[PDB]
Amino acid sequence: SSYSGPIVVDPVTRIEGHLRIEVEVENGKVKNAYSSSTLFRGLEIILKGRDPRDAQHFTQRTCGVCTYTHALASTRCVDNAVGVHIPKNATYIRNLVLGAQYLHDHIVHFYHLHALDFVDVTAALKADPAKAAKVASSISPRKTTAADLKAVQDKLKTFVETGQLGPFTNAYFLGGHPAYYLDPETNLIATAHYLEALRLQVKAARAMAVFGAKNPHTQFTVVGGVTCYDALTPQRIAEFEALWKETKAFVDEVYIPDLLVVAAAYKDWTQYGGTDNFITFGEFPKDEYDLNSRFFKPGVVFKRDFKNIKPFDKMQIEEHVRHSWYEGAEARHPWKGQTQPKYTDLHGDDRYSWMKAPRYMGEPMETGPLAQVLIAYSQGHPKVKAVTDAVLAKLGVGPEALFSTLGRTAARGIETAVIAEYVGVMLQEYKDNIAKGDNVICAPWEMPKQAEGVGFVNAPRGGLSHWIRIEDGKIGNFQLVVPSTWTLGPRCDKNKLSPVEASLIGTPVADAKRPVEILRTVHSFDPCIACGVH
Amino acid sequence: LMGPRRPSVVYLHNAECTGCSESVLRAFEPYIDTLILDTLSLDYHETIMAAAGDAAEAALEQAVNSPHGFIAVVEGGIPTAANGIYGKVANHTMLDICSRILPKAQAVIAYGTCATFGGVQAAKPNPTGAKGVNDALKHLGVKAINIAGCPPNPYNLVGTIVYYLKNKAAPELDSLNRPTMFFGQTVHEQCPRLPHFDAGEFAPSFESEEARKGWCLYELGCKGPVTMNNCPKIKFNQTNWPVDAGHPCIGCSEPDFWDAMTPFYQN
Ligand code: SF4
Ligand code: SF4
Ligand code: F3S
Ligand SMILES: [Mg+2]
Numbered sequence: 001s002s003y004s005g006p007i008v009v010d011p012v013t014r015i016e017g018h019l020r021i022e023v024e025v026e027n028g029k030v031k032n033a034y035s036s037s038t039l040f041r042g043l044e045i046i047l048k049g050r051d052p053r054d055a056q057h058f059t060q061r062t063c064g065v066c067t068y069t070h071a072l073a074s075t076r077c078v079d080n081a082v083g084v085h086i087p088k089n090a091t092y093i094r095n096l097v098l099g100a101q102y103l104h105d106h107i108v109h110f111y112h113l114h115a116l117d118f119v120d121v122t123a124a125l126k127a128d129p130a131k132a133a134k135v136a137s138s139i140s141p142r143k144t145t146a147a148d149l150k151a152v153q154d155k156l157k158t159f160v161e162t163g164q165l166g167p168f169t170n171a172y173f174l175g176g177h178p179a180y181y182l183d184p185e186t187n188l189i190a191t192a193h194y195l196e197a198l199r200l201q202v203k204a205a206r207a208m209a210v211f212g213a214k215n216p217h218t219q220f221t222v223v224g225g226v227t228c229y230d231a232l233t234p235q236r237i238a239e240f241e242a243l244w245k246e247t248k249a250f251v252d253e254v255y256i257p258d259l260l261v262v263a264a265a266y267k268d269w270t271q272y273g274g275t276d277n278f279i280t281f282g283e284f285p286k287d288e289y290d291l292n293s294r295f296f297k298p299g300v301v302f303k304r305d306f307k308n309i310k311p312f313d314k315m316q317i318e319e320h321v322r323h324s325w326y327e328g329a330e331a332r333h334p335w336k337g338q339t340q341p342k343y344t345d346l347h348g349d350d351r352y353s354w355m356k357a358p359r360y361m362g363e364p365m366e367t368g369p370l371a372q373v374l375i376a377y378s379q380g381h382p383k384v385k386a387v388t389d390a391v392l393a394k395l396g397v398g399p400e401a402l403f404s405t406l407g408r409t410a411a412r413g414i415e416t417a418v419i420a421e422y423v424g425v426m427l428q429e430y431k432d433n434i435a436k437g438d439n440v441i442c443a444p445w446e447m448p449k450q451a452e453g454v455g456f457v458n459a460p461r462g463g464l465s466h467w468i469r470i471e472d473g474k475i476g477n478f479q480l481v482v483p484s485t486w487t488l489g490p491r492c493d494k495n496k497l498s499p500v501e502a503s504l505i506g507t508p509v510a511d512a513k514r515p516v517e518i519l520r521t522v523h524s525f526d527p528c529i530a531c532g533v534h
Numbered sequence: 535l536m537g538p539r540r541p542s543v544v545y546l547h548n549a550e551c552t553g554c555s556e557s558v559l560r561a562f563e564p565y566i567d568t569l570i571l572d573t574l575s576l577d578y579h580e581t582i583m584a585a586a587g588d589a590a591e592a593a594l595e596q597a598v599n600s601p602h603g604f605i606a607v608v609e610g611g612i613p614t615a616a617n618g619i620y621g622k623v624a625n626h627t628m629l630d631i632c633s634r635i636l637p638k639a640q641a642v643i644a645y646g647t648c649a650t651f652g653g654v655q656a657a658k659p660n661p662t663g664a665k666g667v668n669d670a671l672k673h674l675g676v677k678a679i680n681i682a683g684c685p686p687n688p689y690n691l692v693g694t695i696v697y698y699l700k701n702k703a704a705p706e707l708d709s710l711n712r713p714t715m716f717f718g719q720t721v722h723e724q725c726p727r728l729p730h731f732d733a734g735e736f737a738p739s740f741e742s743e744e745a746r747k748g749w750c751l752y753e754l755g756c757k758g759p760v761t762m763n764n765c766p767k768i769k770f771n772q773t774n775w776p777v778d779a780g781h782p783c784i785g786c787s788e789p790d791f792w793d794a795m796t797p798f799y800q801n
Binding site: 008009011012013014016017018019027029038039040041042043045046050051053054057058061062063064066069112113116121155159162163164166167168169170171172173198199201202204205208209210211213214215216218219220221223224226227228229230231238335339341343345346439440441442443444461469489512514515519530 | 536542549551552553559567571579609618661662698740771772774
């Protein structure tokens, strides 16, 4: 049973948006890959001519998974264009809502998007709940009993016995699958926590609404700061704090232990889905005009050379179109960007995606949690180093294991733990600032007739940048360069495979009809195709 | 997948940002686990379903062709320019997919302003020829219940579904096909700042003392007076809504709002 031939996965489910993955398999291993993004909306086209203040409202609708992030990027971009330095409290509030977004996003990703690649929910029915409870209680300070897990099993049994499997219909694990390794008890633990996470994420998202009006699609940012005077009140701060504390407990007591128990069972996944180059923008500023004031700092690494972290030069970004469904072949810096659709169908004129192909100094760059974590580690970030080291020790592997699908999945957890703690620090700083009598949340500003601006966010999937050219006080050009564009865009005009494409080379496929190994690697990048294409 | 006992839902994603899907995950009393385990059978949903690729499309076919019937919930506008090619799933255009599936549903719910009215990708100059469901598919007789908003309140989706299951019919609908039980009042008539509006007490800027004191946001662009939604009453996430967070309504439950309500900071 070792397959040669093509495999197509379309739709790739358990991602945001519309992705088609094509691979060539030789003797049971992937030899070639294409990342094809199959929806275009054209938000950059739509923005032309509009009021720059309106941009954040449009661009937030790039994506509702990474909700708020694009509103933040656009507002940072216009703030920068107009030269406003927002008040300290606006930085704190914006940063706190972003920290909350990370926690919501990564929890939902691990459980609700990624875990069905590794957890056989139906095998949980076979589990001994008393054994499972002992295992659950051994990995977490949270105690779980046999009765706790039997309640999950009973509910699942009723569901499965109805024959209406709903979201589990035709799952790759049904019937068993050679690439699914977990024992019944570990499947039961993970399934219980998947279900628990459906309710916990309500709280994690609510934290954003406390200051940010609503989730999805927050409504509290303006050029110059934020609008939410109520966010200054002890009652709203307490509400936020309570939701954050519960979310952090879930991260620390449920997500991270589950991530480690699954990683330990799938340790062969240290051998697949590595990448070469990494880019990150930093996040959580003290100074909106200095990336190096961020809690995570920006950086660039080539060929895994983490002893030689390069500064991030924003002028070294160009977005390619040669293998994309846009006119011509000319890569552009986003202040000179072009969004000129021209569809040629799959592989027509060697074009296969609605995503552009961003390159940094000509190179394909992974961005997202693995980039943020590895670069921060290598910059001496003490919290990142403590958590990363503890994870590596628990798993019994060396740092080289991070350059993999398992590694990337781990890094997502690492960053979640680190950011969950840091939200508490920001919250305290914010309280302290209010207590000094600083009650200002928005600063005045004036629209220039002509300007350029850029806003940088390190979002849950990596380095996000929004770029404006203001002309006659209106949007002359507005370009989004989004994390999933970097990671999941196609080849460039040098024919270099993108990070996701390159990472797929070497993937074993046990059963070409149920190619869960491709999903494991693709999902480890946490794709967002509405983000990547816009 | 589904057969008997819980009603089958097929959830489709067209030209969308997945914010509407995310809104459904915020369901409260009932929560989403109750909805998918007890209330309904969620038989296709690209965001959360286990199967991918061919296995996913076979799950869709099984659901749509079931003799038991299904409800369609549709997120996103349908791109119609250039014969639909701006949006494809499994190498079929979204126009083609929806044209084939939606007439087979017992009921269709267009969830979110994109599915109801065309939404963000339909804003000028609408390069993809994006349309709402009923506009795109009028010629096939599809008349989806429109639950508008960007994203809507998930209360409004659950309430519509529950009504339909109980009564075997749509609730009373307005002239935009939206349920009057949720969309019968303007945001503004429900707004706590209405007494300031009446008194001509408007914040002149977001930094102003008037904004600090909660004065009306109309001068800063609030579209509450021209927007039908239940935001002030139900709130979002059991805790807040735009005006209570100090920001004007942008009109997000209205047709063409991206072009009709802009510039967002002017009235
Ligand atoms: S209605 Fe708004 S939130 Fe829903 S899919 Fe459209 S853009 Fe996204
Ligand atoms: S803030 Fe908006 S919705 Fe409230 S009273 Fe003023 S105009 Fe009406
Ligand atoms: S912007 Fe939308 S969410 Fe409600 S307050 Fe206005 S209708
Ligand atoms: Mg772009």
